[PDB]
Design a binder for this molecule. Structure first.
Ligand code: FES
Ligand code: FES
Ligand code: FES
Ligand SMILES: [Fe+2]
Ligand SMILES: [Fe+2]
Ligand SMILES: [Fe+2]
Ligand SMILES: [Fe+2]
Ligand SMILES: [Fe+2]
Ligand SMILES: [Fe+2]
Lengths: 374, 374, 374
């Protein structure tokens, strides 16, 4: 085999991370989806969680009763503002600390006050509810999101969908330095007079990327293919004309970078005034939550309401769907090749794949843990 | 792990009985569903059987041809009153002894008279067709049904449904001594003026149950929680009023018991003039046949026709469905927790679970065999 | 059991051939389904292939890009007559030799010209496109089809359907002499005055079959039960009248034979003026492509157009479906019994099964390889 072991050695941990990285923050829902006193069940990294907002504060608990292991969310019953009672025998837990404070069906039980559901640390920023999945004290959320995502003046809006592919197919697709070819028919092209070449003739391999590995700040890789190559706007087949790219006035996706636990930052995009952020949150081994966020620097309540309107009325359908919908096929089609780990050894990479290789190495070395099941 | 082994030790056989107990009688269909010369296929304990009534007598044979292993019931063909002929090559077997008595496609075959389909002992009582699944001589049916079920004066009617959970989830749910909380919204409460607390404050653990262990009579456990506890009608959470039970003049479920191979007896229920009997017949590892029978002592053919009409016009929708429908969620929600055996070790039981523990111990020690595949 | 090992010894390879035999020709589609410049994906023996007709010539290549392993046919894109370009990063391959001749997204890539998709030898005869699946040089197509199928004067037409069963269930069912019992109610019987018995009373087991194993020509088995038995047109059950066959004046299925890699020849059928040929091409372990071809010796372009018309207007619904639709249930019902290999040991065969046994032995000894999937 190895030949293959030597080639994949530096990313063995990544190859094993079918369920994602443990001990990191992950966004799971939009703020508006988690309303006051209205529990919402979610699943991430194979773990079933139940969310709820109490007095404006979002709380997260394991979505499973400690008694007979039923799923609490199968029939949500709350009889006090701060608690949820299991629908089977009334074991009652607090949302803030998961403690079993009462048992409606037997107030004399010696089990009362002796147990607690697992709770997940929560952070709600930029219209997203983030959960920390791990066993160690959480580090700052800033270390798990792209640089600038938490900037005070950055207005953010987004949407999410479930993709039938492992989360890694999402990140591989998202940070793939030379895949613009798949977007050559996007309505966003002439819809926003954006320039989109067919591909790139890469320069020196050592110049194509830059990695950030310091402590106290997000760790990731910058894709520098753009400034170190000759954009391809026309290509031939066996010497004959075959196809052309799409030249336009606006140059976007000037700075592309990916960060642990696996979040993309495309700047500027889909317009010189916007920045796109993407997450590929693991749900289970065969699915991921593809979260697409668009941000715009705002200086007043007025230009904020303005961006909000432009987001829903234009960008969602023109870009988030009009441009990115073609990415889903890529993820679904690569899925089977990599689902059994064979792809990591059999793939035949070329020049523009240097960036993903650097991401695989960095992710393998700096992730805070490999999520596993039982 | 060692603490788990010691705790589950007395019921390890039960943990392995995913397919039920072998060498016991099991009801599979209502008498009316097995009509004269109208073969009906069934599956119990993972075994596929074909039933038919010939001259009033119900017969049961393995639902698989000895030749090429096809399922006989895929296309039932009978060319003589006493036989069934496989639809593929005409191997012909007698219903009464499973004997290969003819081969329509080759009357001179040396195989004729040299083989026989497996046959299952049958007993038809109280409108139910019972099959003995096992290799030893059948003991009396009375030993596998609750006390009184076969009383000459008991008029019986019932219905069944397939539940998406292991049979043990059905029995655990049925004999769960303190689960009335799940039935607090049943239309039966107001519908039949039945009292229903939210739970119970159990007395001495040693007084909560009584076990009966053969020989020559059904073996099972009596749930004595009602007699040794304080009914819980008012529930609180952290000192504040949370929810309340329901008052009624009719007292039901005075006596609850479960018997091997796994049948419940609730008396009286759902009315002082009735008794409910429940079976959780294993179909395969993930499904069971939930059989609900209601019995009423009758003294004349007049009050028999009366009970029959009441059963259909009132009790089926008011109780069998109106009360027990909420039980299905419980079985389905516990299913995954116990399907991989981890639930038996990870569950956190409390006081009212003494009864189910006594059942698991009794079932483990006295079952006549563990049904397996291969 | 040692008894089972000894019994199945002579056909152990056949038992392992769940995916079919490697190094043989297999028909995959009708010529009309593979049009000029209109790529069509197919799957045989677990391998995904992409077909296309360029300048009237059919080409076949592996349906998977060498780059990231996506399925090319998920979005066919051709920018030059002789090539196909992957929809993801534009790697471009020639249909005739699978060579990676260009990479639209990076014309300077060092990978260009250093790789080639696997190609499959192709043969197009009698309105069918045959593919050779193997690693060795292809032998003559004539060695993998029934005798006379390629005769110059044989006009051929047919249809195919995917069947939910392993390919062997198709061959087993096809070359089975006692199976005519399943066809006793076929509309073809009265519809064409066909004489179809219920079964047969075979003679010496030694003259029931004849094998052909010479080199240079197809290898197979001739079913000689007909010319060596007493056909059963009426049969009794326990001495009493039970069922009758279907006498007629048109004699068909006079000569039945099966040939490697697994193709049946029934002559004449479904009419004295026709010959039926059937293929059971493995798709994957649980499905096969059931190809039904009808041939008629023709001497003029007029009777050729006449047969073509009769095929469409009469034989398709009266025989291909009217007669063979019943064979499908047989294959599906046997499927589970043999899917886990238990069937080969537990089946109880009788006299007329001598023919299938001869096929299993011949197929085991002469197949050119067992197809396997890592
Ligand atoms: S399973 Fe939740 S209170 Fe019993
Ligand atoms: S499979 Fe039943 S008679 Fe042949
Ligand atoms: S996956 Fe086909 S060119 Fe990249
Ligand atoms: Fe899915
Ligand atoms: Fe993309
Ligand atoms: Fe099911
Ligand atoms: Fe209940
Ligand atoms: Fe299928
Ligand atoms: Fe047939």
């Amino acid at each position: 085999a190895g030949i293959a072991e030597r080639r994949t050695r530096a990313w063995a941990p990544y190859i094993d991370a079918k369920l994602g990285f443990r001990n990191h923050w992950y966004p799971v829902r939009l703020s508006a989806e988690v309303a006051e006193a209205s529990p919402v069940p979610v699943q991430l990294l194979g773990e079933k969680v139940l969310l709820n907002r109490v007095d404006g504060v979002v709380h997260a608990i394991a979505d499973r009763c400690l008694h007979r292991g039923v799923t609490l969310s199968d029939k949500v019953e709350c009889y006090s503002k701060a608690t949820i009672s299991c629908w089977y025998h009334g074991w009652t837990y607090r949302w803030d600390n998961g403690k079993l404070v009462d048992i409606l069906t037997n107030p004399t039980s010696v089990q009362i006050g002796r147990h607690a559901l697992k709770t997940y640390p929560v952070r709600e920023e930029k219209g997203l509810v983030f959960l920390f999945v791990g066993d160690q004290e959480p580090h700052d959320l800033a270390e798990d999101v792209p640089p600038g995502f938490l900037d005070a003046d950055l207005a953010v809006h987004g949407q999410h969908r479930v993709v039938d592919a492992n989360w890694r197919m999402g990140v591989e697709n998202g940070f793939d330095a030379g895949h613009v070819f798949i977007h050559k028919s996007s309505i966003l092209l002439d819809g926003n007079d954006i320039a989109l070449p067919l591909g790139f003739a890469p320069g020196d391999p050592e110049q194509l990327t830059r990695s950030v590995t310091g402590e106290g700040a997000p760790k990731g890789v910058f894709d520098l293919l753009g400034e170190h190559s000759v954009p391809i706007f026309e290509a031939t087949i066996e010497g004959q004309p075959a196809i052309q790219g799409h030249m336009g006035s606006k140059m976007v996706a000037i700075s592309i970078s990916v960060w642990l636990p696996g979040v993309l930052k495309v700047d500027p995009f889909p317009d010189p005034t916007l920045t796109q952020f993407e997450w590929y949150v693991p749900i289970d081994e065969g699915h991921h939550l593809y979260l697409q966020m668009l941000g715009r620097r705002v200086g007043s309540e007025e230009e904020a309401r303005s961006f909000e309107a432009e987001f829903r009325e234009k960008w969602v359908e023109l870009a988030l769907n009009g441009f990115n919908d073609d990415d889903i096929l890529a993820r679904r089609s690569m899925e089977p090749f990599y689902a059994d780990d064979r792809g990591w050894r059999e793939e035949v990479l070329f020049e523009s794949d240097r960036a993903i290789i650097e991401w695989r190495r960095l992710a393998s070395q700096y992730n805070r843990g490999i999520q596993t099941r039982d």
